[PDB]
């Protein structure tokens, strides 16, 4: 329940502190939306990551299901993000997310 989100939501903050650890976390499945912008795919969110290197997260929302987890953050230049994680084999990946700010 609340450790398996707890390394989910630092693992995304850690990934949030180091740009290339956001690249491994991301499949083909992988589906990003930002400012009406949409990045989808492996690569795609790699080529993401690089561009969010430029920027005290909060987190407003936590729901936690076994397989997958929805999480909702507050980015503070202020934005709102929502997450969807999926666990796989003891790692995760993201399944999608999207900056509306």
């Not at 397989?67 to 666990?87: A, H």
């Amino acid at each position: 329940m609340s450790e398996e989100a707890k390394i989910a939501i630092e693992l995304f903050k850690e990934a949030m502190k180091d740009p290339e650890r956001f690249k491994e976390m991301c499949s083909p499945d992988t589906r990003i939306e930002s400012n009406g912008q949409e990045y989808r795919g492996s690569e795609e969110c790699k080529k993401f990551a690089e561009e969010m290197k430029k920027t005290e997260v909060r987190v407003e929302r936590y729901r936690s299901d076994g397989d997958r987890f929805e999480i909702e953050l507050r980015v503070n230049k202020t934005f709102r993000m929502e997450i969807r994680m999926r666990k796989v084999n003891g790692e995760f990946r993201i399944e999608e997310m999207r900056l509306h700010g």
